[PDB]
Structures are given as structure tokens and as C-alpha cells.
Design a binder for these strands. Structure first.
Ligand SMILES: [Mg+2]
Ligand SMILES: [Mg+2]
Ligand SMILES: [Mg+2]
Ligand SMILES: [Mg+2]
Ligand SMILES: [Mg+2]
Ligand SMILES: [Mg+2]
Ligand SMILES: [Mg+2]
Ligand SMILES: [Mg+2]
Ligand SMILES: [Mg+2]
Ligand SMILES: [Mg+2]
Ligand SMILES: [Mg+2]
Ligand SMILES: [Mg+2]
Ligand SMILES: [Mg+2]
Ligand SMILES: [Mg+2]
Ligand SMILES: [Mg+2]
Ligand SMILES: [Mg+2]
Ligand SMILES: [Mg+2]
Ligand SMILES: [Mg+2]
Ligand SMILES: [Mg+2]
Ligand SMILES: [Mg+2]
Ligand SMILES: [Mg+2]
Ligand SMILES: [Mg+2]
Ligand SMILES: [Mg+2]
Ligand SMILES: [Mg+2]
Ligand SMILES: [Mg+2]
Ligand SMILES: [Mg+2]
Ligand SMILES: [Mg+2]
Ligand SMILES: [Mg+2]
Ligand SMILES: [Mg+2]
Ligand SMILES: [Mg+2]
Ligand SMILES: [Mg+2]
Ligand SMILES: [Mg+2]
Ligand SMILES: [Mg+2]
Lengths: 61, 138, 386, 226
RNA sequence: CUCAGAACUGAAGCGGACAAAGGUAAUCCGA
RNA sequence: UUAGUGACGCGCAUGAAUGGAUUAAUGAGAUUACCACUGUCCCUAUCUACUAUCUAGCGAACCCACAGCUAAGGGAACGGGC
RNA sequence: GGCUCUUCCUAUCAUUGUGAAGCAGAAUUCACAACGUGUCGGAUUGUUCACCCGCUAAUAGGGAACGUGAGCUGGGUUUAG
RNA sequence: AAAUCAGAUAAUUGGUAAAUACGGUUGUCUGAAAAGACAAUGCCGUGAAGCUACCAUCUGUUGGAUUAUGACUGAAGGCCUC
């Protein structure tokens, strides 16, 4: 298999070698595909409220 | 009586994020809040290259804020978390949101019991006592 | 004054003077040590820099941090279309060094190679090799080859980079000497002959997990300030003329400046022989499977989605090397075998490839294939076609 | 039977580098022959000795926990390490990957084949997973008023060794709780890190080289190996 | 022409350009 | 911490309108910490405009025994000339 | 004086190969061929020096108009307040 | 395997944005909307390509002759001795 990661902002499908990881005081890790992703999720913007997100597409289907 | 003697192997490559003077959180209950970074072990530099430590390193530091018994002396500490992104064998880069360390004796023993927050993988392999005291290890 | 604090010098002198290169394709000024051991083999080969991607492999190498784990590594893809062989060249050993005894040309020398001799092919009557054609006598050729057998130390094949197979501007081929290493002069010659007017494939030369050498020209950075060139430490930012200078060009005596002190000048466009690059893969421009793995089990071509940036699609065969190599995309390169066959660990390491990334490099790509992007957006191009 | 001393490279911390239960043993990948020897020599036929790594680290000792019915690996765990483990494991025992913010499972969980003690703050789901999988009764506690039980107390089905500063009261509560005798002490020449210095299961005990004759006596005596 | 309330709404942004003090504790001079 | 502050004072050579001791406000006035801050630094990168560049046109000045590759030697004891 | 940079010396600090010992091992000391490569980060001081805190294989000593102001800097020194 | 050095590269991660790329927004102006322009880059966020960094990655051989020193054979000089 080719093991696929999921983006903790938009839940986009990530492959090996791309992206980054954050670790908060909690010990909660996050895995971002895009710098743009990281910036948003650390700005504490809600994924639901941003249109290109899968979150948003969930809310409104 | 000094040095890092209780290290269990080779420490992996981490981008050095904590040069000298760097002040980091102290995650142990030793009662010191922070660590002021004085030197880092095993370094011969180039002209005017600041000595740097990263996750897993053993530094030489002092305590700026904490129990009056601790500050004003020179102690050794072991870096746990760093905010400078480094990279792991999977190609992903990681970072924590703080710079954290734990005061330790040169033998690799911690002075303390609980370690606040997670400890980085790269610290465990090297320092089994630290690893023992970890709540979580990433 | 004994200088105050001692630090190493600011460049390798063996890399100076720093001026541009005459050698545009690679020039190997040594070919690997020749051994009588093996039948005659072809020493090097030519290719072109296509792009980079990354790989996920699994490491069997024992004692390593990484034993039995997945690693991701950077990789360069070099397109390696078939080379044609044109001629044979004998060399004599003389007290003043080696010398060219003779060159045996085939009957078939295709227009593009002839281009080498011309600056513009189409405004020329294309007169090159005519006399070699009309007067061509196989007997004589055989005589020349016999000659080489008689008098010669070294034998090399005159080789042909066929540019028409690529999509680039330059169609004018490349004309190389590739020396032939094999036990007996005679057999070298026989071999060389077998080659004439034929096409040689990279597989003929390079294997997998084999160690490589890459010869070529660094990317040109033009006229360079001293900081960029030798990496001097920059002067105090308070400095009156500017700080990007070196502070002291030299002491009073001697009365001039030594060749050793760094100065402004050209950086870039030099020739480098880079050693010990590992071959992670060699693949045929026919496999549409060539980019995939035992672990993948799906169709993949090495060409990234939207194609290699500033290069193109790779239809031909290729070698995929560990790491990076000299020069900008599209620079031709000469891949030569190691001077002495490499016996060290990294060279013995058997390579198990798991993922090869086909993801677009033009942006940050999350799609490995068109089919993927399409499934995601619910556009079937097979549907639009229908 | 007897308690045997070993060294992992130069450390006494064997507790960090292996996990011992009545059904299996786990040891880190890069070990010296002498290590493996001291293990195989005693446990070889009886139990699988499984060389593995977790999240590509040699600390398997502190990062996972389990008894003879189950193994609980942290989310640190790479798929392949998991598979390797399932393939090296008797079908009886089951393996599970947990997501617990507190990732050192060996630090946060002590278990024997009946009772398990967990970090006071652990996830309910983690709890019932320990319960269901290991097949055990679970209690959230603190040895010596420290939150890491796995690190500060060591147990087989007979008795247990606990951090040397545990009050008599505490010792009582716990003994009653686990239904086994407990004893406060030290290992590895005075260390209070008992978990890091010791592994034990019902018939076997491994411990660090520097553990004094006295201390080993203590061990042999409470863990009822003879 | 000033002042105050309430509710709703946004990537928690809003003196959005322009404009516009960095603090603290001491020592020496000269008011 | 040859720095700052507080003390002691066998003050080279402190001392009373040749003023001594104090002192709020105050200062583009001397000094020391600390907090915030940061490209001062680790360690250097990149971007814009005008230059330097090349071109059409226009067009000076300093300076100039004679000139201009060095090694040593001797020499008005560091030559470019011998 | 420092900064910057280059090169030379060897009366070698470290690294290479050795001889010697009141050389068991470890460490150390004396000597030989020998610079080929290296010889660092801060307190106070304008400092050369000095003294301390450190890392280090080692933290050697020197020369080049007391190397280096149409390279900086201008703290010191030495006009006029 | 690391450090210092050397030579390169830019898949990834970072940095850079006057591609004035796309969006947001303050003040003004075009009757309005829409669309813009002016405030030597209005400001803010992301921003491809390029350039770029231990802040990213890759790569850095093999013989011969000898020194000090230790030896073989050995004479001057029956024995001795590199
Ligand atoms: Mg400070
Ligand atoms: Mg400096
Ligand atoms: Mg040198
Ligand atoms: Mg040659
Ligand atoms: Mg470079
Ligand atoms: Mg000028
Ligand atoms: Mg209101
Ligand atoms: Mg609101
Ligand atoms: Mg604001
Ligand atoms: Mg201020
Ligand atoms: Mg005044
Ligand atoms: Mg100071
Ligand atoms: Mg003082
Ligand atoms: Mg003032
Ligand atoms: Mg022109
Ligand atoms: Mg002109
Ligand atoms: Mg003279
Ligand atoms: Mg002269
Ligand atoms: Mg000498
Ligand atoms: Mg003497
Ligand atoms: Mg300084
Ligand atoms: Mg001078
Ligand atoms: Mg004056
Ligand atoms: Mg970017
Ligand atoms: Mg407007
Ligand atoms: Mg409008
Ligand atoms: Mg206008
Ligand atoms: Mg104006
Ligand atoms: Mg403005
Ligand atoms: Mg902008
Ligand atoms: Mg940006
Ligand atoms: Mg390397
Ligand atoms: Mg090397």
C-alpha cells in the first residue's frame, strides 16, 4: 500500500514528503499540507467557515 | 565531575534551534521555570559561530526564574521540545510551540519526577531516565 | 601581527582560477582504471537533467540509524535516450603522451550529427562526409581497424547523442569519445566494430544500486561579489564604502596581491566531476509502469503532473540518482563509471523502493495522477472524450 | 530460578528497552549480543522474544504496556512495527494501537495478568481498552503521589516493588487494591526509578547491573521467584 | 449637532492608508 | 563583571558662598541593570527605484623627472632603474 | 586596538609514525621526523596584556612597515568648550 | 555517524514577491451600481516560477618513493655492529 495522511485543517489527502507538523501544549499533534493550511489553523480560523475546505463542503452539502 | 555520561547512543540530526543565550521553558518540577543557555556540549565552532543546541542535546545553563535555591548556579539540562522545525526520516518537518528543557545531572539523571508536556522522540533514545519520566513521547 | 584568531581559508584553491568552462558537455579527463578482467565494456554515457522528485525506500543497511525503516530521500531524474555509435579511435602511447592514431567512420552519419560541424545546417549545402560516402571502401576500414590492433594502447568509440528524441530546442547532436575498457586490444577493437552504426542503451552501461559519476557544468551565476563567491564573512554593517567587500586585500609586503586572496569575479559555469552518486532506478521509456513500485501496483510515469518544470515530459529511458547533481534543467551530462569500482557500504546497499512521487512540482501538488484530480472534482476526461 | 543482571549498551535502564509479560518479551532492535543472550538464555523456548522498535525508537519498554492477553502500543507506532509484532505474537494475545495524549503507555500503565493501574488522567476509552483488551480490572492511582505508575511501580502476579518513598498507608491501599503483597525499595544501586531498572514476570526477573546484592535479594523475595 | 442602550453579521478583523510616546529601577551633574 | 550600586576610609591630593551636605520638578547632559523589542549578531538571503554597465549627444579635474613584473644582494641601513 | 583576509616561521598546542621513563594499566613527562590540517563561544577592560565562565583533539608561540585607516571603525591617544 | 572544510544543488521545509498573481481593506475621485485609478509598492493575507540556507538536500579515491624509528646480511677490526 501507499500510506496516505490526512490534513488536519481541510482533510486533504497527503502523500509522503509533503507538509509539516505542529505539537501544542496538549500533546495534540496536527499535520498540515499547506503553509496556507498551517497559517489558518494556527490563526484559529474554523475550517468550516472557509469555502475550499472539506469541512465547509460537509456543512453545506 | 561533569559531561553527558548517561547518553545511550547516537543523537540524530536536528536543525539547531537554540543558540547560546536562548531561554527556554523548564518542564520538570525541579521548581525552576526557565533555562538560560550557556554552552552546549561537544562543540568546536568556526569564528564567531554561536554554539547551538537542539532537541536531544545536553546544554549547560542557569536558572533565571525559579526557586532561589536553583538560580545563581550553573546546571546541566537536556532539551526536550524546540520550536525550530527539524526533519525526520519520513521527510515531514515538525515543531513544538515552546522551547523546553529538563535539568539533569551529568549522569543523565533528572532532578524531578513529572515532566510537563510531551517529550520529543529524539530525546528518548538518548536519555532513558528522561524517557522514563515522560507523560507522552512524540 | 600574527593574525588574531585562526580560521580555515575561504575557498579551495584546487578549484581556481574560477573562470567559466570550455567543456560544455562533460569532459572526463580520466576514464576508469582499465582492467583486463572483463570483456570490453563501454566507459560512460550521456544524459540530460530532467527534474527532481522524492522517494520512500526501506533500508536493509545494518548498523544504521535507519535499519529496517522507511526513509524519504531526494532524487534527480536524468533522461537517457539511446546513444548512437559513429566511429572508432585508436590511441598511441608516445614519449610526449597519448596521441590519436586514427578515426574510423561508418557509412551512416545522420544529418543532426553532421550539424556538429556546422553553425547552421539549413543555409549550408550540407557537404559534410560526402567524400567519405562516395569513396567508402569497407576493405580500407577493416585495414584501419587492423592498424589499430597493431599499434594501439587505448581504444575509444566515437559516440552520438541523438537530440531528436527529446523535445528541446537544440537538435544538433553531441559527439563524444567513450573509451573502451577490456582485456585485449584486439577484442576492444572487435567490440568497437560490433558497435558501429548501432544504438547503445543506458542499461548496456549502468545497473541498479550501482555507483555513478556525474560530469557537467555548474549553473552560471554570472559576475559574483566576494561574499557569494568565496563566502567571506561580511564586514561591519557600519562600513563606509560598503560591507560586501573583504577587509584586507593583503599586507604591505609583498608589494602585490597574492593569487590566494579572494576577489570579485565570475561564479558559475564551471566543470565538475561529482563522485559516487547512487542509482536508485533505471527505467525504460516504454513502461508506463516505470514510475511505480511492487508496493504501488498502479500505473505511474516518472513525469510529474503538469510535467517537469522548465524541462518537459520524459518519454525516453532514464536513470534516477540519489540526491542532486550539477547544473540547471536540460543541461546534458556525462555519466561516467567510477575510476575504481566502489566497494563501500552505501555502494553495496541493495535498494528497496516503495514510493516514487509523481505529484506536480509546479505548485504544491496533492495529486499523483490526473485520474485522482478528476475523481476528486468529479470530472471524467474519459467521459468528456465519450 | 534467579534474577539476572544486564546492561543495554552502557545503561542500567533495561526497563526502558524491553517489555516483559508472562506470554511474551519485547526488546529493542539495535541491541548487543550480550543483551539478547541474557534474555534468550532464560526465556527462549517458553516465550517469543520479539525484537522491535516503536515509532522507530528503542524505548519499547516505556512506550507500550500489556499482559498475557494483550499489547497496547502508542499512536507513535509505525504500521510495519505493528505487523512485525502481530506476526511475532501467539494468536492468543491481541494487539491494539491506542491514541492517548499520554503516549508512554509503559509509563502510564502498570499491568499484571489481573489488575492494571493507570495514570489518573487517561482517557476513558483508553481505560476500557486496557480493560477489554488486557482483560483486567483498572484503577487510576498515583504511586508515591506521582502520576507515572508504570515508571514508579513494577508487578507480577505474586507481588510488587514500588517507589521507596511510598507511605505505609499508600502501600496498604495498593496491596488491597491489586490483591498482592507490595514492598518499597530501590533498584540499580539506589535508584527510585524502579520501573526503568526492572522487568519481571511470574518466573523471571531481569534488572540492571549495578543493582546491589541486597536489592536483588529484595526483588527475588517479593516477586516470589525463589 | 452631542450622549447612551440593545440585536444581528464577518477568516476575532475594525486609530485597517494617513496620523501616532516603548517601559522600569538606580548613580552624577545643573535647580 | 578593571563595569554599576551600598558600605568601610593609615583620604598621593575631599571640606565649608575659592561654598560644604542635601534635593521634588526637570535634560537632544555623563553611567548600570532590567522588561518589551528587534537582521546588532549567529548567517547571511531576497525584492523595488537610481547608479555603475552599453549606446546617441555632450565632456572636465587631480596628478605627471623618466617610468612602471619580481627574488636576493649590496646601497642614504625597505629599489623600478644597479 | 579591534574587525576583515592572505601568507610565512617552528622555539609543535592538537592530529600522524616513532625513540625514552622513577612507562603495570590509565594518565603524564623527555626526545625525534613533522605544520599536512586545525587551533573556538562570552563576563569586565579602548585595550596589547590580564582575569574569570565554557565547549574542545587541542583551545600552541610568532612574522609580514609592532601585516592590514584613498578597507572600515574611532573606544583609547594628542588642538580649540 | 558527527564536527570543521570543500564543491554542487532546490524534491521537501523555510526565506523572499512590484509575477502588482488573487483576495481583503482605509482616505479620495469617476452621479450610482459594477469597474477602477491616485496615496514614488496605501496597507494586510496567502502567493507559482526564480533566487536562496546546516534554516534545505547531495558528494567528497588509489598507488609509488621515502623520513624518524625498528630490523636482515655484513666488513673494516677472526669476535662486534641496522
Ligand atoms: Mg539576559
Ligand atoms: Mg568575532
Ligand atoms: Mg592553514
Ligand atoms: Mg590522464
Ligand atoms: Mg552555497
Ligand atoms: Mg567608488
Ligand atoms: Mg452601544
Ligand atoms: Mg462580533
Ligand atoms: Mg492595528
Ligand atoms: Mg531606553
Ligand atoms: Mg540646564
Ligand atoms: Mg555589561
Ligand atoms: Mg566593581
Ligand atoms: Mg536623562
Ligand atoms: Mg546594446
Ligand atoms: Mg556615450
Ligand atoms: Mg639589505
Ligand atoms: Mg625587488
Ligand atoms: Mg623541530
Ligand atoms: Mg630541557
Ligand atoms: Mg566580544
Ligand atoms: Mg601597525
Ligand atoms: Mg580639550
Ligand atoms: Mg513557499
Ligand atoms: Mg474605496
Ligand atoms: Mg464599487
Ligand atoms: Mg489624480
Ligand atoms: Mg504628495
Ligand atoms: Mg507609505
Ligand atoms: Mg503584499
Ligand atoms: Mg509571506
Ligand atoms: Mg556529509
Ligand atoms: Mg567524508
Amino acid at each position: 500500500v501507499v500510506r496516505t495522511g490526512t490534513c488536519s485543517f481541510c482533510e486533504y489527502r497527503i502523500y509522503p514528503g509533503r507538509g509539516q507538523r505542529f505539537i501544542a501544549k496538549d500533546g495534540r499533534g496536527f499535520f498540515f499540507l499547506t503553509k496556507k493550511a498551517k497559517c489558518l489553523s494556527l490563526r484559529k480560523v474554523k475550517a468550516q467557515k472557509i469555502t475550499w475546505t472539506i469541512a465547509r463542503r460537509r456543512l453545506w452539502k | 565531575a561533569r559531561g553527558r555520561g548517561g547518553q545511550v547512543g547516537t543523537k540524530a540530526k536536528v536543525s539547531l534551534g537554540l543558540p547560546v543565550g536562548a531561554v527556554m521553558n523548564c518542564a520538570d518540577n525541579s521548581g525552576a521555570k526557565n533555562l538560560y543557555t550557556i554552552a552546549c556540549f561537544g562543540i568546536k565552532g568556526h569564528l564567531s559561530k554561536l554554539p547551538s543546541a537542539s532537541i536531544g542535546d545536553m546544554i549547560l545553563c542557569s536558572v533565571k526564574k525559579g526557586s532561589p535555591k536553583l538560580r545563581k548556579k550553573v546546571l546541566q539540562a537536556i532539551v526536550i521540545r524546540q520550536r525550530r522545525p527539524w526533519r525526520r526520516r519520513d521527510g515531514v518537518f515538525i515543531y513544538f510551540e515552546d522551547n523546553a528543557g529538563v535539568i539533569a545531572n551529568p549522569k543523565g539523571e533528572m532532578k524531578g519526577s513529572q515532566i510537563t508536556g510531551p517529550v520529543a522522540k529524539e530525546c528518548a533514545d538518548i536519555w532513558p531516565k528522561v524517557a522514563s519520566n515522560a507523560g507522552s513521547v512524540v | 601581527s600574527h593574525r588574531k584568531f585562526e580560521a580555515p581559508r575561504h575557498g579551495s584553491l584546487g578549484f581556481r582560477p574560477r573562470r567559466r568552462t570550455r567543456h560544455h558537455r562533460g569532459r572526463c579527463r580520466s576514464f576508469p582504471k582499465d582492467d583486463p578482467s572483463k570483456k570490453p565494456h563501454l566507459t560512460a554515457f550521456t544524459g540530460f537533467k530532467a527534474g527532481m522528485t522524492h522517494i520512500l525506500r526501506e533500508v536493509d543497511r545494518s548498523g544504521s540509524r535507519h535499519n529496517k525503516k522507511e526513509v524519504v530521500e531526494a532524487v534527480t531524474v536524468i533522461e537517457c535516450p539511446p546513444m548512437t555509435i559513429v566511429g572508432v579511435v585508436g590511441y598511441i602511447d608516445t614519449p610526449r603522451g597519448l596521441r590519436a592514431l586514427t578515426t574510423v567512420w561508418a557509412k551512416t552519419i545522420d544529418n543532426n550529427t553532421k550539424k556538429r560541424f556546422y553553425k547552421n545546417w539549413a543555409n549550408s549545402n550540407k557537404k559534410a562526409f560526402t567524400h567519405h560516402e562516395k569513396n567508402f571502401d569497407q576493405k580500407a576500414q577493416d585495414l584501419l581497424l587492423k592498424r589499430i590492433e597493431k599499434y594501439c594502447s587505448v581504444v575509444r568509440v566515437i559516440a552520438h547523442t541523438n537530440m531528436s528524441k527529446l523535445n528541446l530546442r537544440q537538435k544538433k547532436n553531441h559527439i563524444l569519445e567513450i573509451q573502451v575498457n577490456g582485456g585485449k586490444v584486439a577484442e576492444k577493437v572487435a567490440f568497437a566494430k560490433s558497435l558501429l552504426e548501432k544504438e547503445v542503451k543506458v542499461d548496456s552501461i549502468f545497473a541498479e544500486n550501482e555507483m555513478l559519476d556525474v560530469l557537467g557544468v555548474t549553473k552560471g551565476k554570472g559576475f559574483a561579489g566576494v561574499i557569494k563567491r568565496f563566502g567571506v564573512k561580511h564586514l561591519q554593517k557600519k562600513t563606509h564604502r560598503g560591507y560586501r567587500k573583504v577587509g584586507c586585500i593583503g599586507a604591505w609586503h609583498p608589494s602585490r596581491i597574492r593569487f590566494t586572496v579572494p576577489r570579485a569575479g565570475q561564479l558559475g559555469y564551471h566543470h565538475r566531476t561529482e563522485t559516487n552518486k547512487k542509482v536508485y532506478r533505471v527505467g525504460k521509456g516504454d513502461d508506463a509502469s516505470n514510475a511505480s513500485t511492487a508496493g504501488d501496483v498502479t500505473d505511474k510515469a516518472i513525469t510529474p503532473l503538469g510535467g517537469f518544470p522548465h524541462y518537459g515530459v520524459v518519454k525516453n529511458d532514464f536513470i534516477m540518482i540519489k540526491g542532486c547533481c550539477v547544473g540547471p534543467k536540460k543541461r546534458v551530462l556525462t555519466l561516467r563509471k567510477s575510476i575504481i569500482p566502489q566497494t563501500h557500504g552505501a555502494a553495496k546497499e541493495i535498494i528497496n523502493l516503495k514510493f516514487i512521487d509523481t505529484s506536480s512540482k509546479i505548485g504544491h501538488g496533492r495529486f499523483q495522477t490526473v485520474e485522482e484530480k478528476d475523481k476528486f472534482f468529479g470530472r471524467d476526461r474519459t467521459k468528456k472524450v465519450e | 530460578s534467579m534474577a539476572r543482571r544486564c546492561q543495554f549498551e552502557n545503561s542500567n535502564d533495561i526497563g526502558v528497552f524491553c517489555k516483559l509479560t508472562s506470554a511474551y518479551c519485547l526488546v529493542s532492535v539495535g541491541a548487543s549480543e550480550n543483551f539478547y543472550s541474557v534474555f534468550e538464555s532464560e526465556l527462549v523456548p517458553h516465550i517469543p522474544v520479539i525484537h522491535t522498535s516503536i515509532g522507530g525508537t528503542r524505548i519499547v519498554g516505556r512506550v507500550t504496556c500489556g499482559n498475557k492477553n494483550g499489547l497496547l502500543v502508542p499512536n507513535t507506532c509505525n504500521d510495519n512495527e505493528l505487523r512485525n509484532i502481530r506476526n511475532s505474537l501467539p494468536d492468543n494475545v491481541r494487539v491494539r494501537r491506542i491514541e492517548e495524549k499520554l503516549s508512554a503507555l509503559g509509563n502510564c500503565v502498570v499491568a499484571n495478568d489481573y489488575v492494571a493501574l493507570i495514570h489518573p488522567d487517561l482517557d476513558r476509552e483508553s481505560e476500557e481498552i486496557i480493560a477489554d483488551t488486557l482483560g483486567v480490572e483498572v484503577f487510576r492511582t498515583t504511586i508515591a503521589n506521582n502520576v507515572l505508575v508504570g515508571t514508579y511501580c513494577v508487578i507480577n502476579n505474586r507481588g510488587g516493588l514500588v517507589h521507596p518513598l511510598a507511605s505505609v498507608e499508600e502501600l496498604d491501599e495498593l496491596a488491597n487494591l491489586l490483591q498482592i503483597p507490595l514492598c518499597a525499595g530501590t533498584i540499580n544501586r539506589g535508584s527510585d526509578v524502579i520501573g526503568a531498572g526492572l522487568v519481571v514476570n511470574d518466573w523471571a526477573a531481569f534488572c540492571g547491573l549495578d543493582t546491589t546484592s541486597t536489592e536483588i535479594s529484595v526483588v527475588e523475595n517479593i516477586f516470589k521467584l525463589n
